[PDB]
Amino acid sequence: YDYTIARISDLRMKDKIVMTFILPNESEPHPLQHGVLGFIPEYLVDFNMIRN
Amino acid sequence: YDYTIARISDLRMKDKIVMTFILPNESEPHPLQHGVLGFIPEYLVDFNMIRN
């Protein structure tokens, strides 16, 4: 069995362990990965505005 | 006689013949010419504006 260790200092995981099955060979959506993060690249806009 | 025929689809011209004398050889106003177009060429203006 093969494992990958992850860490976050975030608080709600204080002494909390979660574990599940993931696949490290596919980058594409498939019914066999725990979750997929659909990401749209994002850009900013800068302009001058009047408000009240 | 020379003649020029022009047609339009506007209903306000239904079955109506309009005649006059014109002078199709000048590009300047002249007392015998029928009608002249006072034409100030306005240029489109592109600009962001605040509305409400």
Side-chain angles (χ1 to χ4, degrees):
Chain A
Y1 288 167
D2 296 330
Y3 64 92
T4 304
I5 301 271
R7 287 94 167 286
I8 297 209
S9 298
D10 178 76
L11 182 43
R12 292 181 179 91
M13 301 265 268
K14 183 202 162 65
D15 263 8
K16 182 73 62 53
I17 297 191
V18 67
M19 51 176 48
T20 188
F21 309 118
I22 62 165
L23 288 172
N25 269 24
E26 301 166 80
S27 296
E28 299 70 14
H30 205 198
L32 285 187
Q33 313 84 300
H34 184 94
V36 300
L37 192 43
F39 193 107
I40 297 186
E42 294 294 328
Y43 290 107
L44 74 164
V45 61
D46 163 38
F47 61 72
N48 186 51
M49 187 66 204
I50 192 53
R51 172 174 290 110
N52 205 357
Chain B
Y1 281 123
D2 294 331
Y3 68 96
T4 301
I5 297 172
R7 81 292 183 276
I8 62 183
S9 300
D10 182 354
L11 290 191
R12 311 145 60 169
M13 271 305 88
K14 263 312 181 193
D15 282 328
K16 184 162 321 203
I17 298 103
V18 170
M19 303 214 268
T20 181
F21 287 164
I22 62 173
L23 198 79
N25 264 317
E26 311 315 349
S27 200
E28 69 275 16
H30 187 273
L32 300 174
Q33 199 277 322
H34 190 189
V36 294
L37 158 56
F39 194 110
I40 297 85
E42 171 65 56
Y43 303 136
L44 61 83
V45 191
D46 270 343
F47 84 107
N48 295 320
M49 71 76 87
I50 192 58
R51 194 171 271 120
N52 168 0

mmCIF file with all atom_site columns, all heavy atoms in Angstrom, chain A residues 1-21:
data_model
loop_
_atom_site.group_PDB
_atom_site.id
_atom_site.type_symbol
_atom_site.label_atom_id
_atom_site.label_alt_id
_atom_site.label_comp_id
_atom_site.label_asym_id
_atom_site.label_entity_id
_atom_site.label_seq_id
_atom_site.pdbx_PDB_ins_code
_atom_site.Cartn_x
_atom_site.Cartn_y
_atom_site.Cartn_z
_atom_site.occupancy
_atom_site.B_iso_or_equiv
_atom_site.pdbx_formal_charge
_atom_site.auth_seq_id
_atom_site.auth_comp_id
_atom_site.auth_asym_id
_atom_site.auth_atom_id
_atom_site.pdbx_PDB_model_num
ATOM 1   N N   . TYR A 1 1  ? 0.843   -1.186 0.000  1.00 0.00 ? 1  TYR A N   1
ATOM 2   C CA  . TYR A 1 1  ? 0.000   0.000  0.000  1.00 0.00 ? 1  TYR A CA  1
ATOM 3   C C   . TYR A 1 1  ? 0.879   1.236  0.000  1.00 0.00 ? 1  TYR A C   1
ATOM 4   O O   . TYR A 1 1  ? 1.926   1.263  0.648  1.00 0.00 ? 1  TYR A O   1
ATOM 5   C CB  . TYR A 1 1  ? -0.959  0.025  1.192  1.00 0.00 ? 1  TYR A CB  1
ATOM 6   C CG  . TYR A 1 1  ? -2.073  -0.983 1.086  1.00 0.00 ? 1  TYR A CG  1
ATOM 7   C CD1 . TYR A 1 1  ? -2.867  -1.287 2.178  1.00 0.00 ? 1  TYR A CD1 1
ATOM 8   C CD2 . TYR A 1 1  ? -2.348  -1.609 -0.119 1.00 0.00 ? 1  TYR A CD2 1
ATOM 9   C CE1 . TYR A 1 1  ? -3.896  -2.200 2.076  1.00 0.00 ? 1  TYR A CE1 1
ATOM 10  C CE2 . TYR A 1 1  ? -3.372  -2.521 -0.231 1.00 0.00 ? 1  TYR A CE2 1
ATOM 11  C CZ  . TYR A 1 1  ? -4.143  -2.813 0.869  1.00 0.00 ? 1  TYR A CZ  1
ATOM 12  O OH  . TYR A 1 1  ? -5.165  -3.726 0.758  1.00 0.00 ? 1  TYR A OH  1
ATOM 13  N N   . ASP A 1 2  ? 0.445   2.245  -0.737 1.00 0.00 ? 2  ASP A N   1
ATOM 14  C CA  . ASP A 1 2  ? 1.213   3.461  -0.932 1.00 0.00 ? 2  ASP A CA  1
ATOM 15  C C   . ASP A 1 2  ? 0.462   4.649  -0.351 1.00 0.00 ? 2  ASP A C   1
ATOM 16  O O   . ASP A 1 2  ? -0.761  4.754  -0.465 1.00 0.00 ? 2  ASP A O   1
ATOM 17  C CB  . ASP A 1 2  ? 1.490   3.680  -2.416 1.00 0.00 ? 2  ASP A CB  1
ATOM 18  C CG  . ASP A 1 2  ? 2.350   2.586  -3.005 1.00 0.00 ? 2  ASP A CG  1
ATOM 19  O OD1 . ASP A 1 2  ? 3.167   2.009  -2.258 1.00 0.00 ? 2  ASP A OD1 1
ATOM 20  O OD2 . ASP A 1 2  ? 2.205   2.295  -4.210 1.00 0.00 ? 2  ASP A OD2 1
ATOM 21  N N   . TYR A 1 3  ? 1.210   5.551  0.272  1.00 0.00 ? 3  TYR A N   1
ATOM 22  C CA  . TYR A 1 3  ? 0.635   6.626  1.059  1.00 0.00 ? 3  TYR A CA  1
ATOM 23  C C   . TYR A 1 3  ? 1.349   7.932  0.758  1.00 0.00 ? 3  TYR A C   1
ATOM 24  O O   . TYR A 1 3  ? 2.525   7.945  0.388  1.00 0.00 ? 3  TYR A O   1
ATOM 25  C CB  . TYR A 1 3  ? 0.733   6.301  2.549  1.00 0.00 ? 3  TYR A CB  1
ATOM 26  C CG  . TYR A 1 3  ? 2.156   6.196  3.037  1.00 0.00 ? 3  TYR A CG  1
ATOM 27  C CD1 . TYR A 1 3  ? 2.819   7.297  3.557  1.00 0.00 ? 3  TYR A CD1 1
ATOM 28  C CD2 . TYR A 1 3  ? 2.827   4.985  3.001  1.00 0.00 ? 3  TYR A CD2 1
ATOM 29  C CE1 . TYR A 1 3  ? 4.119   7.197  4.004  1.00 0.00 ? 3  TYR A CE1 1
ATOM 30  C CE2 . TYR A 1 3  ? 4.124   4.876  3.443  1.00 0.00 ? 3  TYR A CE2 1
ATOM 31  C CZ  . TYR A 1 3  ? 4.766   5.983  3.947  1.00 0.00 ? 3  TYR A CZ  1
ATOM 32  O OH  . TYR A 1 3  ? 6.063   5.873  4.394  1.00 0.00 ? 3  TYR A OH  1
ATOM 33  N N   . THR A 1 4  ? 0.624   9.034  0.920  1.00 0.00 ? 4  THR A N   1
ATOM 34  C CA  . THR A 1 4  ? 1.194   10.367 0.805  1.00 0.00 ? 4  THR A CA  1
ATOM 35  C C   . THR A 1 4  ? 0.760   11.184 2.011  1.00 0.00 ? 4  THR A C   1
ATOM 36  O O   . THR A 1 4  ? -0.436  11.275 2.302  1.00 0.00 ? 4  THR A O   1
ATOM 37  C CB  . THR A 1 4  ? 0.750   11.050 -0.487 1.00 0.00 ? 4  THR A CB  1
ATOM 38  O OG1 . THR A 1 4  ? 1.098   10.221 -1.602 1.00 0.00 ? 4  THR A OG1 1
ATOM 39  C CG2 . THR A 1 4  ? 1.449   12.388 -0.630 1.00 0.00 ? 4  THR A CG2 1
ATOM 40  N N   . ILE A 1 5  ? 1.724   11.790 2.696  1.00 0.00 ? 5  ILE A N   1
ATOM 41  C CA  . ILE A 1 5  ? 1.479   12.507 3.942  1.00 0.00 ? 5  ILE A CA  1
ATOM 42  C C   . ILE A 1 5  ? 1.241   13.973 3.623  1.00 0.00 ? 5  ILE A C   1
ATOM 43  O O   . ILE A 1 5  ? 2.039   14.599 2.915  1.00 0.00 ? 5  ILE A O   1
ATOM 44  C CB  . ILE A 1 5  ? 2.661   12.347 4.911  1.00 0.00 ? 5  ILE A CB  1
ATOM 45  C CG1 . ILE A 1 5  ? 2.908   10.872 5.226  1.00 0.00 ? 5  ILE A CG1 1
ATOM 46  C CG2 . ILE A 1 5  ? 2.410   13.136 6.185  1.00 0.00 ? 5  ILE A CG2 1
ATOM 47  C CD1 . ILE A 1 5  ? 2.126   10.356 6.399  1.00 0.00 ? 5  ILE A CD1 1
ATOM 48  N N   . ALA A 1 6  ? 0.150   14.527 4.144  1.00 0.00 ? 6  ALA A N   1
ATOM 49  C CA  . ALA A 1 6  ? -0.184  15.928 3.949  1.00 0.00 ? 6  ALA A CA  1
ATOM 50  C C   . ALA A 1 6  ? -0.321  16.622 5.298  1.00 0.00 ? 6  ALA A C   1
ATOM 51  O O   . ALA A 1 6  ? -0.670  15.996 6.301  1.00 0.00 ? 6  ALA A O   1
ATOM 52  C CB  . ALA A 1 6  ? -1.481  16.087 3.149  1.00 0.00 ? 6  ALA A CB  1
ATOM 53  N N   . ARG A 1 7  ? -0.043  17.922 5.315  1.00 0.00 ? 7  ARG A N   1
ATOM 54  C CA  . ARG A 1 7  ? -0.124  18.717 6.528  1.00 0.00 ? 7  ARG A CA  1
ATOM 55  C C   . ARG A 1 7  ? -0.785  20.060 6.254  1.00 0.00 ? 7  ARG A C   1
ATOM 56  O O   . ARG A 1 7  ? -0.508  20.717 5.248  1.00 0.00 ? 7  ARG A O   1
ATOM 57  C CB  . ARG A 1 7  ? 1.262   18.977 7.131  1.00 0.00 ? 7  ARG A CB  1
ATOM 58  C CG  . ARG A 1 7  ? 1.921   17.793 7.798  1.00 0.00 ? 7  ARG A CG  1
ATOM 59  C CD  . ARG A 1 7  ? 2.831   17.056 6.841  1.00 0.00 ? 7  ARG A CD  1
ATOM 60  N NE  . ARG A 1 7  ? 3.692   16.107 7.535  1.00 0.00 ? 7  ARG A NE  1
ATOM 61  C CZ  . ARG A 1 7  ? 4.737   16.446 8.281  1.00 0.00 ? 7  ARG A CZ  1
ATOM 62  N NH1 . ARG A 1 7  ? 5.089   17.710 8.442  1.00 0.00 ? 7  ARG A NH1 1
ATOM 63  N NH2 . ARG A 1 7  ? 5.446   15.491 8.876  1.00 0.00 ? 7  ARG A NH2 1
ATOM 64  N N   . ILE A 1 8  ? -1.661  20.467 7.172  1.00 0.00 ? 8  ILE A N   1
ATOM 65  C CA  . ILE A 1 8  ? -2.085  21.860 7.274  1.00 0.00 ? 8  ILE A CA  1
ATOM 66  C C   . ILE A 1 8  ? -2.148  22.219 8.749  1.00 0.00 ? 8  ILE A C   1
ATOM 67  O O   . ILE A 1 8  ? -2.626  21.436 9.572  1.00 0.00 ? 8  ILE A O   1
ATOM 68  C CB  . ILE A 1 8  ? -3.445  22.119 6.579  1.00 0.00 ? 8  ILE A CB  1
ATOM 69  C CG1 . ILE A 1 8  ? -3.366  21.860 5.082  1.00 0.00 ? 8  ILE A CG1 1
ATOM 70  C CG2 . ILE A 1 8  ? -3.846  23.544 6.783  1.00 0.00 ? 8  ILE A CG2 1
ATOM 71  C CD1 . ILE A 1 8  ? -4.330  22.712 4.265  1.00 0.00 ? 8  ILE A CD1 1
ATOM 72  N N   . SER A 1 9  ? -1.677  23.419 9.081  1.00 0.00 ? 9  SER A N   1
ATOM 73  C CA  . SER A 1 9  ? -1.736  23.927 10.442 1.00 0.00 ? 9  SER A CA  1
ATOM 74  C C   . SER A 1 9  ? -3.107  24.484 10.790 1.00 0.00 ? 9  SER A C   1
ATOM 75  O O   . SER A 1 9  ? -3.286  25.030 11.883 1.00 0.00 ? 9  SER A O   1
ATOM 76  C CB  . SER A 1 9  ? -0.665  24.999 10.648 1.00 0.00 ? 9  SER A CB  1
ATOM 77  O OG  . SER A 1 9  ? 0.634   24.457 10.472 1.00 0.00 ? 9  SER A OG  1
ATOM 78  N N   . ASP A 1 10 ? -4.075  24.355 9.885  1.00 0.00 ? 10 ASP A N   1
ATOM 79  C CA  . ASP A 1 10 ? -5.401  24.910 10.109 1.00 0.00 ? 10 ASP A CA  1
ATOM 80  C C   . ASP A 1 10 ? -6.057  24.272 11.326 1.00 0.00 ? 10 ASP A C   1
ATOM 81  O O   . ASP A 1 10 ? -5.799  23.114 11.658 1.00 0.00 ? 10 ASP A O   1
ATOM 82  C CB  . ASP A 1 10 ? -6.268  24.705 8.874  1.00 0.00 ? 10 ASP A CB  1
ATOM 83  C CG  . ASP A 1 10 ? -7.657  25.217 9.066  1.00 0.00 ? 10 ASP A CG  1
ATOM 84  O OD1 . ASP A 1 10 ? -7.842  26.449 9.018  1.00 0.00 ? 10 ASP A OD1 1
ATOM 85  O OD2 . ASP A 1 10 ? -8.560  24.385 9.281  1.00 0.00 ? 10 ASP A OD2 1
ATOM 86  N N   . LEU A 1 11 ? -6.912  25.041 11.996 1.00 0.00 ? 11 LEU A N   1
ATOM 87  C CA  . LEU A 1 11 ? -7.336  24.710 13.347 1.00 0.00 ? 11 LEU A CA  1
ATOM 88  C C   . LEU A 1 11 ? -8.343  23.565 13.425 1.00 0.00 ? 11 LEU A C   1
ATOM 89  O O   . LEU A 1 11 ? -8.167  22.683 14.270 1.00 0.00 ? 11 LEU A O   1
ATOM 90  C CB  . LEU A 1 11 ? -7.923  25.946 14.034 1.00 0.00 ? 11 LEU A CB  1
ATOM 91  C CG  . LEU A 1 11 ? -8.384  25.773 15.486 1.00 0.00 ? 11 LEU A CG  1
ATOM 92  C CD1 . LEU A 1 11 ? -7.375  24.966 16.300 1.00 0.00 ? 11 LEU A CD1 1
ATOM 93  C CD2 . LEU A 1 11 ? -8.654  27.119 16.145 1.00 0.00 ? 11 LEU A CD2 1
ATOM 94  N N   . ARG A 1 12 ? -9.381  23.523 12.576 1.00 0.00 ? 12 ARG A N   1
ATOM 95  C CA  . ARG A 1 12 ? -10.387 22.484 12.790 1.00 0.00 ? 12 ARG A CA  1
ATOM 96  C C   . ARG A 1 12 ? -9.848  21.075 12.594 1.00 0.00 ? 12 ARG A C   1
ATOM 97  O O   . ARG A 1 12 ? -10.515 20.118 13.000 1.00 0.00 ? 12 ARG A O   1
ATOM 98  C CB  . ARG A 1 12 ? -11.625 22.632 11.896 1.00 0.00 ? 12 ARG A CB  1
ATOM 99  C CG  . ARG A 1 12 ? -12.534 23.823 12.163 1.00 0.00 ? 12 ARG A CG  1
ATOM 100 C CD  . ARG A 1 12 ? -13.716 23.779 11.190 1.00 0.00 ? 12 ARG A CD  1
ATOM 101 N NE  . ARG A 1 12 ? -14.673 24.864 11.380 1.00 0.00 ? 12 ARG A NE  1
ATOM 102 C CZ  . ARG A 1 12 ? -14.630 26.033 10.757 1.00 0.00 ? 12 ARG A CZ  1
ATOM 103 N NH1 . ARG A 1 12 ? -13.769 26.262 9.786  1.00 0.00 ? 12 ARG A NH1 1
ATOM 104 N NH2 . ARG A 1 12 ? -15.509 26.977 11.083 1.00 0.00 ? 12 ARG A NH2 1
ATOM 105 N N   . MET A 1 13 ? -8.674  20.915 11.992 1.00 0.00 ? 13 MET A N   1
ATOM 106 C CA  . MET A 1 13 ? -8.038  19.611 11.924 1.00 0.00 ? 13 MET A CA  1
ATOM 107 C C   . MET A 1 13 ? -7.168  19.323 13.136 1.00 0.00 ? 13 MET A C   1
ATOM 108 O O   . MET A 1 13 ? -6.328  18.420 13.079 1.00 0.00 ? 13 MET A O   1
ATOM 109 C CB  . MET A 1 13 ? -7.212  19.478 10.644 1.00 0.00 ? 13 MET A CB  1
ATOM 110 C CG  . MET A 1 13 ? -8.009  19.652 9.377  1.00 0.00 ? 13 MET A CG  1
ATOM 111 S SD  . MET A 1 13 ? -8.541  18.051 8.751  1.00 0.00 ? 13 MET A SD  1
ATOM 112 C CE  . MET A 1 13 ? -7.199  17.665 7.639  1.00 0.00 ? 13 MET A CE  1
ATOM 113 N N   . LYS A 1 14 ? -7.358  20.059 14.231 1.00 0.00 ? 14 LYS A N   1
ATOM 114 C CA  . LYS A 1 14 ? -6.561  19.856 15.434 1.00 0.00 ? 14 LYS A CA  1
ATOM 115 C C   . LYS A 1 14 ? -6.708  18.428 15.941 1.00 0.00 ? 14 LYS A C   1
ATOM 116 O O   . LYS A 1 14 ? -7.772  18.042 16.434 1.00 0.00 ? 14 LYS A O   1
ATOM 117 C CB  . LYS A 1 14 ? -6.977  20.851 16.519 1.00 0.00 ? 14 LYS A CB  1
ATOM 118 C CG  . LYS A 1 14 ? -6.159  20.787 17.797 1.00 0.00 ? 14 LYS A CG  1
ATOM 119 C CD  . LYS A 1 14 ? -6.938  21.381 18.963 1.00 0.00 ? 14 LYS A CD  1
ATOM 120 C CE  . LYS A 1 14 ? -6.369  20.955 20.305 1.00 0.00 ? 14 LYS A CE  1
ATOM 121 N NZ  . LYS A 1 14 ? -4.992  21.483 20.510 1.00 0.00 ? 14 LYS A NZ  1
ATOM 122 N N   . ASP A 1 15 ? -5.633  17.647 15.832 1.00 0.00 ? 15 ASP A N   1
ATOM 123 C CA  . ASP A 1 15 ? -5.631  16.238 16.223 1.00 0.00 ? 15 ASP A CA  1
ATOM 124 C C   . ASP A 1 15 ? -6.732  15.463 15.503 1.00 0.00 ? 15 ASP A C   1
ATOM 125 O O   . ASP A 1 15 ? -7.376  14.583 16.076 1.00 0.00 ? 15 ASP A O   1
ATOM 126 C CB  . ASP A 1 15 ? -5.757  16.085 17.738 1.00 0.00 ? 15 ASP A CB  1
ATOM 127 C CG  . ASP A 1 15 ? -4.417  15.891 18.408 1.00 0.00 ? 15 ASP A CG  1
ATOM 128 O OD1 . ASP A 1 15 ? -3.386  16.023 17.720 1.00 0.00 ? 15 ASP A OD1 1
ATOM 129 O OD2 . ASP A 1 15 ? -4.393  15.612 19.624 1.00 0.00 ? 15 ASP A OD2 1
ATOM 130 N N   . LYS A 1 16 ? -6.948  15.796 14.236 1.00 0.00 ? 16 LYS A N   1
ATOM 131 C CA  . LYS A 1 16 ? -7.924  15.122 13.396 1.00 0.00 ? 16 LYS A CA  1
ATOM 132 C C   . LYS A 1 16 ? -7.207  14.467 12.231 1.00 0.00 ? 16 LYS A C   1
ATOM 133 O O   . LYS A 1 16 ? -6.348  15.082 11.595 1.00 0.00 ? 16 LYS A O   1
ATOM 134 C CB  . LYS A 1 16 ? -8.983  16.087 12.866 1.00 0.00 ? 16 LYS A CB  1
ATOM 135 C CG  . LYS A 1 16 ? -10.053 15.412 12.027 1.00 0.00 ? 16 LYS A CG  1
ATOM 136 C CD  . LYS A 1 16 ? -10.991 14.597 12.889 1.00 0.00 ? 16 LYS A CD  1
ATOM 137 C CE  . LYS A 1 16 ? -11.720 15.476 13.886 1.00 0.00 ? 16 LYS A CE  1
ATOM 138 N NZ  . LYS A 1 16 ? -12.387 16.623 13.214 1.00 0.00 ? 16 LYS A NZ  1
ATOM 139 N N   . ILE A 1 17 ? -7.560  13.217 11.955 1.00 0.00 ? 17 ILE A N   1
ATOM 140 C CA  . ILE A 1 17 ? -7.010  12.476 10.830 1.00 0.00 ? 17 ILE A CA  1
ATOM 141 C C   . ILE A 1 17 ? -8.161  12.053 9.934  1.00 0.00 ? 17 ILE A C   1
ATOM 142 O O   . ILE A 1 17 ? -9.148  11.472 10.405 1.00 0.00 ? 17 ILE A O   1
ATOM 143 C CB  . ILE A 1 17 ? -6.199  11.262 11.290 1.00 0.00 ? 17 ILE A CB  1
ATOM 144 C CG1 . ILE A 1 17 ? -4.988  11.701 12.110 1.00 0.00 ? 17 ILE A CG1 1
ATOM 145 C CG2 . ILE A 1 17 ? -5.769  10.434 10.102 1.00 0.00 ? 17 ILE A CG2 1
ATOM 146 C CD1 . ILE A 1 17 ? -4.001  10.587 12.364 1.00 0.00 ? 17 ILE A CD1 1
ATOM 147 N N   . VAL A 1 18 ? -8.042  12.351 8.645  1.00 0.00 ? 18 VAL A N   1
ATOM 148 C CA  . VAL A 1 18 ? -8.978  11.892 7.630  1.00 0.00 ? 18 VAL A CA  1
ATOM 149 C C   . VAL A 1 18 ? -8.186  11.086 6.615  1.00 0.00 ? 18 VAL A C   1
ATOM 150 O O   . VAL A 1 18 ? -6.991  11.334 6.416  1.00 0.00 ? 18 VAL A O   1
ATOM 151 C CB  . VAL A 1 18 ? -9.719  13.067 6.965  1.00 0.00 ? 18 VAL A CB  1
ATOM 152 C CG1 . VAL A 1 18 ? -8.755  13.916 6.161  1.00 0.00 ? 18 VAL A CG1 1
ATOM 153 C CG2 . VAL A 1 18 ? -10.857 12.562 6.092  1.00 0.00 ? 18 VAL A CG2 1
ATOM 154 N N   . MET A 1 19 ? -8.835  10.100 6.004  1.00 0.00 ? 19 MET A N   1
ATOM 155 C CA  . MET A 1 19 ? -8.174  9.209  5.066  1.00 0.00 ? 19 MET A CA  1
ATOM 156 C C   . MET A 1 19 ? -9.177  8.724  4.031  1.00 0.00 ? 19 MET A C   1
ATOM 157 O O   . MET A 1 19 ? -10.342 8.468  4.347  1.00 0.00 ? 19 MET A O   1
ATOM 158 C CB  . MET A 1 19 ? -7.566  8.019  5.797  1.00 0.00 ? 19 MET A CB  1
ATOM 159 C CG  . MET A 1 19 ? -8.574  7.347  6.691  1.00 0.00 ? 19 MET A CG  1
ATOM 160 S SD  . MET A 1 19 ? -7.997  5.860  7.502  1.00 0.00 ? 19 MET A SD  1
ATOM 161 C CE  . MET A 1 19 ? -6.445  6.470  8.115  1.00 0.00 ? 19 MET A CE  1
ATOM 162 N N   . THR A 1 20 ? -8.714  8.595  2.792  1.00 0.00 ? 20 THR A N   1
ATOM 163 C CA  . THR A 1 20 ? -9.555  8.082  1.721  1.00 0.00 ? 20 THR A CA  1
ATOM 164 C C   . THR A 1 20 ? -8.670  7.650  0.566  1.00 0.00 ? 20 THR A C   1
ATOM 165 O O   . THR A 1 20 ? -7.442  7.757  0.621  1.00 0.00 ? 20 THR A O   1
ATOM 166 C CB  . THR A 1 20 ? -10.578 9.115  1.253  1.00 0.00 ? 20 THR A CB  1
ATOM 167 O OG1 . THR A 1 20 ? -11.483 8.499  0.331  1.00 0.00 ? 20 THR A OG1 1
ATOM 168 C CG2 . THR A 1 20 ? -9.880  10.277 0.571  1.00 0.00 ? 20 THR A CG2 1
ATOM 169 N N   . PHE A 1 21 ? -9.314  7.164  -0.487 1.00 0.00 ? 21 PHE A N   1
ATOM 170 C CA  . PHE A 1 21 ? -8.614  6.650  -1.650 1.00 0.00 ? 21 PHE A CA  1
ATOM 171 C C   . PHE A 1 21 ? -8.582  7.690  -2.761 1.00 0.00 ? 21 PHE A C   1
ATOM 172 O O   . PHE A 1 21 ? -9.597  8.305  -3.091 1.00 0.00 ? 21 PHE A O   1
ATOM 173 C CB  . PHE A 1 21 ? -9.285  5.370  -2.145 1.00 0.00 ? 21 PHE A CB  1
ATOM 174 C CG  . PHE A 1 21 ? -9.504  4.350  -1.068 1.00 0.00 ? 21 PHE A CG  1
ATOM 175 C CD1 . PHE A 1 21 ? -10.781 3.937  -0.738 1.00 0.00 ? 21 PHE A CD1 1
ATOM 176 C CD2 . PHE A 1 21 ? -8.436  3.811  -0.377 1.00 0.00 ? 21 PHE A CD2 1
ATOM 177 C CE1 . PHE A 1 21 ? -10.989 3.001  0.253  1.00 0.00 ? 21 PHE A CE1 1
ATOM 178 C CE2 . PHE A 1 21 ? -8.641  2.874  0.615  1.00 0.00 ? 21 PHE A CE2 1
ATOM 179 C CZ  . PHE A 1 21 ? -9.918  2.470  0.930  1.00 0.00 ? 21 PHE A CZ  1
#
